[PDB]
Ligand SMILES: Nc1ncnc2c1ncn2[C@@H]1O[C@H](COP(=O)(O)CP(=O)(O)OP(=O)(O)O)[C@@H](O)[C@H]1O
């Protein structure tokens with residue numbers, strides 16, 4: 001088994017309902033078990049700002065799935081929760097499930113890049129992650145606690 005860490009975001013169609021439904025669906029992923037769910041946070045949008053605030057959270061998911069098999073399931077859940085692709089980059093969505101980390105693995109395939117390429121620059125990913133895994137060390141040896149101690153991130157407010 002490996003512990004994967006998944007970032008959850010939603011800013012459309014009742015984010016609380018979307019995130020709760022996503023947590024139920026994550027539990028139903030085969031060869032996998034949810035270990036920990038963070039608090040829910042209400043966060044101002046990064047990137048384009050002409051959209052509603054996000055509900056952000058993080059989940060620790062123990063799994064024996066291959067990394068791309070996990071991706072298959074997370075994409076399926078997003079699509080089943082009505083995620084529609086629009087042309088605007090970083091536009092609003094009913095559900096976003098980003099695989100932040102897959103154990104200590106470094107993955108670079110056509111469909112999957114892990115660690116998430118920008119997570120070390122996003123408070124809305126790092127703070128919920130720290131809540132559920134304060135001892136976390138990245139594949140490159142960097143400590144999550146040290147990033148959050150050193151770098152300026154705004155405090156997150158709970159939903
Ligand atoms: N770690 C990861 N988690 C989820 N999807 C990933 C991923 N690495 C690559 N992908 C790929 O990313 C593709 C596009 O996903 P999108 O959700 O449209 C990007 P986004 O989440 O809006 O922006 P971001 O990646 O800057 O957070 C997916 O179809 C998937 O194949």
Ligand SMILES: Cc1cccc(C(=O)CSc2nc3c(=O)[nH]c(N)nc3[nH]2)c1
Nearest residue numbers: 009043044045046047054056090121124
């Ligand atoms: C550091 C940086 C620069 C430019 C863009 C971004 C995004 O996160 C774009 S997509 C996105 N996803 C979320 C999200 O899940 N929550 C919040 N608050 N904002 C988000 N924005 C991050």
Ligand SMILES: [Ca+2]
Nearest residue numbers: 027028029032
């Ligand atoms: Ca399961």
Ligand SMILES: [Ca+2]
Nearest residue numbers: 009096097098
């Ligand atoms: Ca994302």
Ligand SMILES: [Ca+2]
Nearest residue numbers: 096097098099
């Ligand atoms: Ca995504």
